Design a protein around this ligand. Structure first.
Ligand SMILES: C=CC(C)(C)OC[C@H]1O[C@H](O[C@@H]2C3=C([C@H](C)COC(C)=O)C[C@H](O)[C@]3(C)/C=C3/[C@@H](COC)CC[C@H]3[C@@H](C)[C@H]2O)[C@H](O)[C@@H](O)[C@@H]1O
Ligand SMILES: C=CC(C)(C)OC[C@H]1O[C@H](O[C@@H]2C3=C([C@H](C)COC(C)=O)C[C@H](O)[C@]3(C)/C=C3/[C@@H](COC)CC[C@H]3[C@@H](C)[C@H]2O)[C@H](O)[C@@H](O)[C@@H]1O
Ligand SMILES: [Mg+2]
Ligand SMILES: [Mg+2]
Ligand SMILES: [Mg+2]
Ligand SMILES: [Mg+2]
Ligand SMILES: [Mg+2]
Ligand SMILES: [Mg+2]
Lengths: 5, 236, 236, 5
């Protein structure tokens, strides 16, 4: 999965 | 509310204890109680709210992904029928996840967004609104998926418009909003080109504003800039 | 019971899904449901039961330790008074932990221990009984601590007596029982010499029986033997 | 803490 914050 | 009898300050104190103990369900419940006192949240308090629910729903999402993968394998050619249990338990986790998302969206709608006038707080809450509609979209299948996706996009877009008008490019909230909206485009909205464009433009404009960024935000903003770079490397 | 309407086989299947998703609260609830069907648990099913509750209470214990440490610091000379909140929240976690321990001990008493006749199962359940009284002892302060400690010791001792009569020294359940009873002696019963003696005797007698141990149990038993060695290194 | 299983 791509990164989120 | 089960927190109705507790002092606001005590709820905030206990949310910080819960964070230290990695008790994120408790942390979220304390922060929900604090929000329901009806006063605006400070900057630090907003971060407690967001971290608590991010971690609760993050664990639900991880579990949902494990179960959905098992379910999809169970529906491949040559797979043995094992009955309704995988679907049932995936649905159980999904319904719990939806419930937490609905709770957060309800707090934002009652009445955090309406009372948030400063750019920081307004963008922060609208980003959260996009995030929790995005998590609803990850599990949505029926007649509802397109409206859920549109709700996420609408919240992210309003946040974006405010952030570009009212915040410097290196503002961590602005950066994190752009990071997550770019992921929305790539993973939810079938718009990888928009995802890549947003990540690159965001990264480049922040690079050019660092000669003014604070030592306070440096680690947050450099972290997020590195996350933008990480995603671009994954995508190109 | 909320699981009363679900098939036993479905509960076991869902406990295994919950394990894969690291949803240990759900896993424990499914296994409690399975136990309450009234049939004995198989070897594999016993392991699901023990892992589920070990992980639930393990997280509660970790959180309790964080909070108790904050509380003790808050009660040192020169520390600023912050009100009842740290104690209150430590008590909240403690009461939840006690509730889970009581639930497990109730399952063991109704009716897993009474129906367990084979050495494997009887020792397994009595070890669990000692473990959950040990966790109650870790948080006990009032007029109850000594009886709780005695209950843990009594359960461990009965398990020990059966294990030495009916199991080879390399049996993983025998080894794990000895590991945990040795920790009971060191950390609960103020008997470090007994803790060290038990760990060493257990390790040495297992070493001498390896020339017969299975490739099935090798990794479990070598793991536990290494844990005995680890504890001896910590203690000497 | 010491190890248990
Ligand atoms: C739970 C509260 C505790 C642990 C006390 O604080 C967490 C972090 O909050 C602050 O970071 C913020 C923050 C994070 C930073 C990127 C973490 O960067 C570092 C070096 O770690 C990750 C958290 O999800 C949080 C609260 C969330 C967001 C998004 C929230 O969108 C609704 C927008 C961007 C970013 C902003 C708000 C960051 O400013 C501090 O600046 C950090 O020091 C601190 O770790
Ligand atoms: C939840 C179930 C799943 C994941 C499927 O199985 C867990 C493990 O169960 C079996 O190990 C057992 C087992 C463990 C082994 C030491 C793990 O050793 C390895 C190499 O990992 C740790 C677990 O706490 C469990 C179930 C508990 C116990 C204690 C229970 O006291 C009430 C007594 C000793 C030991 C026995 C029962 C071990 O025999 C398999 O042999 C392993 O392969 C497998 O990992
Ligand atoms: Mg008040
Ligand atoms: Mg559903
Ligand atoms: Mg654009
Ligand atoms: Mg039946
Ligand atoms: Mg108490
Ligand atoms: Mg002896």
């Amino acid at each position: 999965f791509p990164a989120t914050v | 509310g089960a927190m109705g009898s507790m002092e606001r300050a005590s709820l905030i104190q206990k949310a910080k204890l819960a964070e230290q103990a990695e008790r994120y369900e408790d942390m979220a419940a304390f922060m929900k109680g604090a929000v329901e006192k009806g006063e605006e949240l400070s900057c630090e308090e907003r971060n407690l709210l967001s971290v608590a629910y991010k971690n609760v729903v993050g664990g639900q999402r991880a579990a949902w992904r494990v179960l959905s993968s098992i379910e999809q394998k169970s529906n491949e050619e040559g797979s043995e029928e094992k009955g309704p249990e995988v679907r049932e338990y995936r649905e159980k986790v999904e319904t719990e996840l939806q419930g937490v998302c609905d709770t957060v969206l309800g707090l934002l709608d009652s009445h955090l967004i309406k009372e948030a006038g400063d750019a920081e707080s307004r963008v922060f809450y609208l980003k959260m609104k996009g995030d929790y509609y995005r998590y609803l979209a990850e599990v949505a299948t029926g007649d509802d998926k397109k409206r859920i996706i549109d709700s996420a996009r609408s919240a992210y877009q309003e946040a974006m418009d405010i952030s570009k008008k009212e915040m410097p490019p290196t503002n961590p909230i602005r950066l994190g909003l752009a990071l997550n909206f770019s992921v929305f485009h790539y993973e939810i909205a079938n718009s990888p080109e928009e995802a890549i464009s947003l990540a690159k433009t965001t990264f480049d404009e922040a690079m050019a504003d660092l000669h003014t960024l604070s030592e306070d935000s440096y680690k947050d903003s450099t972290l997020i800039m590195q996350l933008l770079r990480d995603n671009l490397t994954l995508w190109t």
